Symmetry: D2
Subunit: 398 residues, 4 copies
């Protein structure tokens, strides 16, 4: 029942925000509105709904009550005014960019981006007259310099693969604030529990709820959180007319179920990651480790200023790159070889022999991916079992 406004604690709000059982027959768990359409008692009522004069529903693609609860909750957790639920993280990203951008507009992007986001920008909306430019969001001088009068939005992830490179959200937001640019941050890795970009100046945040938010890898979903003004536009244009990325109320319910243990799951992911990162740091076979929790992390101070905890993701490089990375991966027995992250199950991937195996050392390298870089999404399994798997696989990678 306990609302938000950020009064009750985070765990309380992640469980109760926006829902009062007394308002729904006393049902402790909200009933799921698995219906596409809603009916009107009167024609004058339906009209009032369409004209926004009366609060109600009429069609789930535009708005569904079960989705509305998820949206209100996520908004509360992120500290924003409004939320919007979508069929996937890409759905949230595209619906967002498709409505804020038009030909002639420029979009300043972080140096690296999720593959599909990159693909979408360069071979998608980029091919429709939108200008794109990659800049280091940590370098506020370089950013301020790339700012033009056509820069309409600034988009990036933080941390961003492959080295978990961070950006100065507040620094970026201040520059964008003076230029009239819109800042949107993909806060998938941290979640509102570890980082809240909106509180640092960002205008909007996007999430692939398919990851940590759901936490159990049984749904693909996306979330957008920001001001009412901005979110309304994305709902009514990006979502409604473009993309049509509608989230199933069933999936919205499973996501809210996942969010109920968000703080607890993130606490374990991070606790587990820290021990694994430190164990890796002691391995002679490991050349470099990209984990915000290690004191030698290049952006350690900035990370600590934006994230409450170092996260559950680890990237590291094996000396003797490809081959050691391939042997390692193939020896794993608890960790799963798969793409994705934020599941209870621990996952691992070695781009050099997996996603970018088709490239050549040169291609790969001249593109940012090392030959021995493996990324792990540390799960919730027992740390010693995980350490034992990595230890056994490290011996095999030899």
């Amino acid at each position: 029942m306990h609302g938000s406004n950020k009064l009750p604690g985070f765990a309380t709000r992640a469980i109760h925000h926006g829902y009062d059982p007394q308002d729904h027959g006393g049902a402790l768990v909200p009933p799921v509105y698995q219906t596409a359409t809603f009916t009107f008692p009167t024609v004058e009522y339906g009209a009032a709904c369409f004209a926004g004069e009366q609060a109600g529903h009429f069609y789930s693609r535009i708005s569904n009550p079960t989705l509305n609860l998820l949206e209100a909750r996520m908004a509360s957790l992120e500290g924003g005014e409004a939320g919007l639920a979508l069929a996937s993280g890409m759905g949230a990203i595209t619906s967002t960019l498709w409505t804020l951008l038009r030909p002639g507009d420029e979009v300043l992007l972080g140096n690296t981006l999720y593959g599909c986001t990159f693909a979408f920008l360069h071979h998608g909306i980029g091919e429709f007259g939108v200008k794109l430019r990659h800049v280091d969001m940590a370098d506020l001088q370089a950013l301020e310099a790339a700012m033009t009068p056509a820069t309409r939005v600034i988009y990036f992830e933080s941390p961003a693969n492959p080295n978990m490179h961070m950006a100065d959200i507040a620094g970026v937001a201040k520059i964008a604030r003076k230029h009239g640019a819109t800042v949107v941050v993909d806060n998938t890795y941290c979640t509102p529990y570890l980082q809240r970009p909106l509180e640092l100046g960002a205008d909007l945040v996007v999430h692939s709820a398919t990851k940590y938010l759901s936490g159990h890898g049984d749904i693909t979903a996306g979330i957008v959180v920001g001001s009412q003004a901005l979110v309304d536009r994305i709902r009514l244009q990006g979502l409604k007319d473009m993309t049509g990325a509608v989230l199933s109320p069933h999936d919205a319910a499973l996501l809210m179920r996942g969010i109920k243990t968000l703080n607890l799951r993130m606490d374990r992911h991070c606790a587990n990651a820290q021990v694994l990162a430190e164990f890796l740091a002691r391995q002679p076979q490991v050349e470099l480790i990209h984990y915000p929790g290690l004191a030698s992390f290049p952006q350690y101070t900035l990370a600590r200023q934006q994230m409450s905890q170092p996260g559950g993701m680890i990237a590291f490089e094996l000396k003797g790159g490809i081959g050691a990375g391939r042997r390692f991966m193939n020896a794993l027995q608890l960790f799963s070889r798969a793409v994705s992250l934020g599941d209870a199950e621990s996952l691992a991937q070695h781009p050099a022999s997996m996603t970018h195996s088709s490239y050549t050392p040169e291609e790969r390298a001249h593109y940012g991916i090392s030959e021995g870089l493996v990324r792990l999404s540390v799960g919730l399994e027992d740390i010693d079992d995980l350490l034992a798997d990595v230890q056994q696989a490290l011996k095999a990678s030899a």
Copy 2:
């Protein structure tokens, strides 16, 4: 049998196509793959799956086994090569159009279109440099005269609201074949059971499975069926990168459940609609009726030429105009006042008093919105009850 093999009938394929229980633990009903990611036995197998040299899965947004079954079944029903499942009908149309059009390209559109696709075209892609032009798809001469070297796509619904105006599919297809253009037909109203555009020459059909295909209004989904070449492209570009309109395996399973009774339900929708249409024709309150089943239907011959049955949708005008339309709508007891269609539950709507109620008679008249036009989605209820509800509502319109 079981769908393909020999040449099973429609009902047989609607319930068995693509699935042999023997291949899945003997489960009569296929297990639901409610999973976001899939793992690999080796890094090599993963790379191979990415490169497409290996038949497998890795991420549900790109492809999921439950969705694949639905896709293949729908492809069989439409007489096409391949299918794609999306989060909604709009996800299916936007996904298709985003991958087939680029600035400079021109798309020829039916005279009237579903409200959201119209908004998508004129306020979406159209604002990204794509040329839009509306032509009467029933007028094969005007269509050919509009064909240009820039024409890339011909898109229309058949029948189309609000008069169920038809288009000569085989006709526009031959012109398309002679002048290039790709033909996309929105077959939502008919479903593959009543009309198969691909078999008449269309290249692709899009469906708002949220309607007749699901049949029970508890899901929002979309379908695209066409050549492997075109579908592969829409899957890997429009869905994957530009829309993220991913269908939940849960909803896909529910949709396949609904498709299992497609022929039976459509048969009843049509039978009920015919009786209702013939009944409305003898009523003094009705000024005009738009039902493909009435011999006086302007395109009676073409309709009987393209559709196996006249459908379950009826539109008719009330001599009384908006007031009569409103009074009629408010008096209904069995039919529900709501947008959407194709549910077991009969729905009715009066655009002039509902969606465009705030418009002016002139503004509404301009868009082609009549003052006394009401659209009926004839449900599966007992015809006697429906006739009674309509009768009394007609009397109440006085």
Copy 3:
């Protein structure tokens, strides 16, 4: 939103009975109350809820809102006052029998019973001091002669496997009314669409909703319909205390989805069964057929008094016995070799070589299990496909 607005038709009630969207926010499909517990505004409201003086919920095992809708709808379809939803058909019968019988009580049973019902009666409750006696429910004289002051319950299925033996329900109810016994009829095969035992005098009807009612083989469920007093006792005792066969709100919503097309499906099942039955009758491999639709059916007249249509189940004996039965069964390609019935998918079974393959010809004959009897659950596939399958199977069965 009818079902009750002046005794609407069967189809109208199977779709709307008990639900008005306007009472649930306009949601066209009812929201699923997938919640275990319910909260109270005051401890006073709670007590009144537990006390029964308050209309509410507190715990789903006792009563749940979506299960309630299904219960009320099923009650309307069978013409009974109350309904109860359970986890399975066996949960419905055991829950029923557990609350009505006590040691010393006598229960007269139909000559034949569903496999598990027989085992529950004979090796279950029957082993807790309750007395059993099997009698031909068609022979009203033998039944009368069987009544004792200890006779508390009369239980049977109608039609009953394996010969579709019918019982004189109105006659049995007469005798029970005189002796003060409760008549419980298993109406699984016919469904309330083809026979309503309560209207012929039975006191309670039980269903394995797993079959025809769901119609799609994706759920296990049971239903009980009868007087409010009887059902209140079965709910508060058989279910909740002696059986914890709670139905999942998800499976209940699925059952209700399936019930929305019950008339349509049963129509097709029977129509398909009729032609297959007559086809079987012309084949020399078939020495005997058990189908209510053939005028040669022994109880053809009685069957036609209680049943609106002859049903979707057909049983027949193959000349050649076991050998031919195995051959026939193993040759099927559309029909699936499995137990159960009532699915869109045609099912077939041969007891002698399947469930009773272990027995000896004599042990089976002793148990009324013929050597060449095969039972078919005629599905919704195209008859031409169904006929071809059995046709080739008969040729192989030779």
Copy 4:
């Protein structure tokens, strides 16, 4: 992935036990087998499946693949040989006892039992010739004296309400072994994570998975874990014939999803309860406090010998009697007034004014039901929020 009961760790087994993604198309999350029947490739295969010489399913009431994973996983967590999934905790309790006991058998019960379990014992099986006797399972002297050659099973909960009274599980097990009685413990409150009765000597454990195992209050389910020989019997008779309390694969999947965070949720439930119990113990409105985590807890030492943590349940007594409880309960803002427990949401109940408001201080005082007894199911909310709620309610109880 990594199962092996005991090594790997609990969290690892609660996440991976019994499931290797590689065997199911690489699906990270196991596909849900929401099907009622299973088909065979030949009748001889079906026959072997019915004779037990063939591995394979045929009907979900008896056994389902999804339920089987849930079962194997629960068996591992409890350290047992086999598990069984059912529609509810009562389904597990009743299915177990219905197959173990027969007329003439005697059963010794803990002094206090879950409401419906008590009703089932006394007004259910009790009325079928099975003898009952309540003995303090903490008094090994009394238990031994109570033993008789007719004692068939010893049944109890530990902790048990209303004071969280403990039983010496290893103690009663030794006695039971001596005489030859079957010990079954309702381990609902603790979960295999906090207590493993089977490792203490018990023969069977039953759970209301509706509570902590699910953890999110959206499903009703029960679990039985024990020897293979025992569980097989309860499956083939108790569930199959006498109860039919079949668990829906969908609900079993939600259960498994909940179990994936069992350790994390319990850790938090206990941490929160520990803090609330200590606060309550120092409040002037509280006469008594029952929390195993308090050093002053009567059976503190025995509890710590059986439980790894003190649990999330707490009961205390308000000095002001029924009047103080009503005012307390009615003033609760975050805690919900409702029955049940084990949810992410904190629940509270006052038996005197709720479930037993009907009773007079008659048997209420006779069944140990103090007039001021309040039971709290401490949830996962922010402890600061929970403290404030209880604190304010405490003040209002005056």
